[PDB]
């Protein structure tokens, strides 16, 4: 016949937006916790009854390394820390614009230091009226690959902003098997993330000395499973671990926070074992030395920070280990080997392991199509 353009309505279509999402936490508003205080000041209770729509045969290209949600939660967490742990001295630099001796002098800051309790609280992220959030359901997700079993929602699950390096503390587990994620293997430039499917207990207890214990009977099996999954990418070579290569104290050794104390712990007696298809580790309680600090290197920029003296004593911490961060060492001098050292420190990297599913979308109804009819004039 004869094709003629026409304008339709009500077509389903999606896009990508850059709106602002609000927090949502089941706060308490009665205790001294700074997280509770922040949640009470700016957050609202959770949805009494969530509603999830299970969409059908759709296929959308998910990408996690280029998401935009993280760039907002990472700026919200930093604001959160400005209400719990104020610094006695906040020493940061600032330069003066001069083409080139560029002016650069240290600036001093100080306020009150009242000791307060500190414990993370779950937080929910929701989208405003006019947008939706797609979430995937595939058991693997391939990293940054398309998946099919998608669903639509308005809010995320519970998220704990726990901060740490070289080891992922309390957090959600995998579906059925430990998985490895990386932006681009074979470039020895991007951090490798690993997610487990069964947490491993850790218990730290202690004036300037403390110990940490981890169940070896489970840790050996965890390493065995991780290595077994890992050989697939590099079958011929031999995988060997090794302690940190040096740098700032906040990255050479495990560092975390507990009860207003900044714990630093060496982690050498965990990566000295060269691994093969068989066992070469040993053959109870794995002791782990730790010493608290008062002059630390900030993670929100550059500059040292000092806090008030430590508490009297009797501080305990019990936590679960679910994820892991590992780096790689490549080169042409490699001779049938592959050394994997522990790394991390980029908080964005630590937080991408929790928002790698959700994607924020907007709906577009309009549409143009060629039809077989003709207008009456």
């Amino acid at each position: 016949a004869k094709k003629w353009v026409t304008v339709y309505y009500g077509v389903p279509v999606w896009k990508e937006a850059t709106t602002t999402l609000f927090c949502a936490s089941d706060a308490k508003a009665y205790d001294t916790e700074v997280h509770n205080v922040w949640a009470t000041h700016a957050c609202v209770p959770t949805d009494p009854n969530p509603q999830e729509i299970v969409l059908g045969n759709v296929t959308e290209n998910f990408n996690m390394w280029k998401n935009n949600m993280v760039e907002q939660m990472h700026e919200d967490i930093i604001s959160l820390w400005d209400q719990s742990l104020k610094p006695c001295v906040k020493l940061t630099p600032l330069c003066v614009t001069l083409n080139c001796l560029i002016n650069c002098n240290t600036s001093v800051i100080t306020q009150a230091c009242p000791k307060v309790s500190f414990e993370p609280i779950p937080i929910h992220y929701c989208a405003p009226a006019g947008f939706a959030i797609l979430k995937c359901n595939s058991k693997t997700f391939n990293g940054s690959g398309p998946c099919t079993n998608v669903s639509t929602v308005q809010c995320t699950h519970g998220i704990r902003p726990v901060v740490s390096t070289q080891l992922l503390l309390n957090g959600s587990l995998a579906e059925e098997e430990i998985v490895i994620r990386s932006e681009n293997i074979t470039d020895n430039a991007k951090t490798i993330i690993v997610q487990l499917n069964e947490a491993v207990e850790i218990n730290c207890t202690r004036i300037r000395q403390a110990h940490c214990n981890i169940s070896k009977a489970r840790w050996n099996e965890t390493l065995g499973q991780i290595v077994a999954k890992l050989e697939e990418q590099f079958p011929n070579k031999t995988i060997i671990f090794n302690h940190s290569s040096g740098g700032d104290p906040e990255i050479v050794t495990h560092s975390f926070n507990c009860g207003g104390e900044f714990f630093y712990c060496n982690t050498t007696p965990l990566f000295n074992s060269t691994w093969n298809n068989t066992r070469t580790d040993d053959y109870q309680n794995i002791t782990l030395q730790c010493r608290i600090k008062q002059i630390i290197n900030m993670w929100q920029g550059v500059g040292k920070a000092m806090y008030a003296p430590p508490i009297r004593g009797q501080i305990r911490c019990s936590s679960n280990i679910t994820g892991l961060l590992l780096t790689r060492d490549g080169g042409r001098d490699q001779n049938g080997t592959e050394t994997f050292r522990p790394g991390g420190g980029n908080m964005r990297d630590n937080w991408r392991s929790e928002l790698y599913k959700y994607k924020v979308v907007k709906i577009e109804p309009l549409g143009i199509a060629p039809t077989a009819c003709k207008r009456r004039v």
């Binding site: 003629w4 077509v11 279509v13 609202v44 009494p48």
Partner: protein
């Protein structure tokens, strides 16, 4: 809300009439939870507002007050080079929208010019009657 994504164009077009017939035939609280009621009512009100505004503003091309209109711009072959059945039985809406995303700016001007010409001719005839 006209349909569920993934289904082909023709299937949705066929099913919408049955959906309309069916719809016409008529066949643990936290006192801070009150906020969520407003959060829902605002979304519904905004949806209705946007629907009305878009329906009103769709009148430039002469297709006001309708959900499926028709125009008087001939369909070229350099845009898609595709036939009826293949388009209306395959190529889910998102894929088709992506296919012709390059020319999605010229067609608007062409349609607006055609509407202007039709209105001018109709007013010229009105001068006669």
């Amino acid at each position: 809300f006209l349909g569920a994504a993934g289904s082909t164009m023709g299937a949705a077009s066929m099913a919408l009439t049955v959906q309309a017939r069916l719809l016409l035939s008529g066949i643990q609280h936290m006192l801070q939870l009150t906020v969520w009621g407003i959060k829902q009512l605002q979304a519904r009100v905004l949806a209705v507002e946007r629907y009305l505004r878009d329906q009103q503003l769709l009148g430039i091309w002469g297709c006001s007050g309708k959900i499926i209109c028709c125009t008087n711009v001939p369909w070229n072959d350099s845009w898609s080079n595709k036939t009826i059945n293949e388009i209306w039985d395959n190529m889910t809406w998102m894929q088709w929208e992506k296919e012709i995303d390059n020319y999605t700016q010229h067609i608007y001007t062409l349609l607006e010019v055609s509407q202007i010409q039709q209105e001018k001719n109709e007013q010229e005839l009105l001068e006669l009657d």
